Amino acid sequence: SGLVGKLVTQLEVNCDADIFYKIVKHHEEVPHFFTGVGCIKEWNYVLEGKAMTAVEETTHADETRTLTHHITEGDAMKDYKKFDVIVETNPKPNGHGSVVTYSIVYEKINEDSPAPFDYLKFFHQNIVDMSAHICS
Amino acid sequence: GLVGKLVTQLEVNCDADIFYKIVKHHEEVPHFFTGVQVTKGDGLVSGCIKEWNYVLEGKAMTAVEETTHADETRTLTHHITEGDAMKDYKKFDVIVETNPKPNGHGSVVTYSIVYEKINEDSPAPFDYLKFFHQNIVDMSAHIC
């Protein structure tokens, strides 16, 4: 037991859901502007001060405001047999502002593998960083 | 960004109805004050109010926690109202759900921390999430 799991961080953001989805989507594809007009790509990042690399297949779905990253190889694969990251944006139930959900769906390589709390804080911080460019 | 939710979900090998009973029993039962069981008025324990004593990253900690459950959804809720955990949060509720896998053998256990920060400089509860994750691991390793 304990090899298959999911970590989620969900944040409320005072921004329309479709607009925030467009900003997240554009930020990941490139950014001079905040908005822009399958796909395998390199993913280079710094995780708690350590530079890392990955290859990921990405998809997006505009109607559900969902970005998906399926990591196929790289530093994350040292601990995981499977590592998928999903970002979803949805309106708050009232309609003023939105809820942003980052999910990491993972399968550990073995029992001594960590669960990806370090990646969760990393993606959480991405939401915070982008939210900071939005005025209240 | 003051309102959010952190979630850890883990597949374990125990049966869902059994795992729910064990969690529920551990949380509804030597302390500083004597915990109390509560009832809705039918000869059934509906919950408990008690001291939660725990160690979080080296520091001993304490809180007042009220537990409620819903045997039908196999859902348990920890409602924390004062103590160490309330130093960063205006709201801190922990929801534990246990559901069978599709094949019916083993289950999926979900801990969700529903939190509201005091201000923007408050951390999100990643330390608590790792603590609760290890509790799932520890509990299942004890169940045959």
Residues 27-86 of B with CB under 8 A from A: none
Q: Which residues of B touch A117 (CB under 8 A)?
A: 126, 129-130, 133
Task: Give φ, ψ of A109 to 5 degrees.
Answer: -75, -45
Q: How far is CA B124 from CA A11, A90, A99, B128, in A?
A: 10, 21, 16, 9
List of chain B residues whose C-beta atoms are within 8 Å of the C-beta of residue A6: 7-9
Task: Find the distance separating the first CA and the last CA of chain A, reported in whole Å.
Answer: 44
Contact (CB<8Å) A117/B137: no
Residue A117 CA to residue A109 CA, distance in Å, equals: 16
Q: DSSP readout, B62-111? A: EEEEEEEEETTTTEEEEEEEEEGGGGTEEEEEEEEEEEE-TTSSSEEEEE
Nearest CB neighbour to B8, from listed A1, A7, A10: A7
Domains of chain B, earliest start first: 3-142 (3.30.530.20)
Residue the block writes with tokens 């408990």: B48
**A11–B contact, CB cutoff 8 A:** yes
Q: A70-93: string of b/e by CB count within 10 Å (b at 16+)? A: bbeebebeebbeebbbbbbbbeee
- Is A69 an active-site residue? yes
Chain breaks in chain B (C to N over 2.5 A) after: 29
Query: CA-to-CA distance for A93 and A95, rounded, in angstroms?
Result: 6
Asked if A120 has any chain B CB less than 8 Å from its own CB, the reply is yes
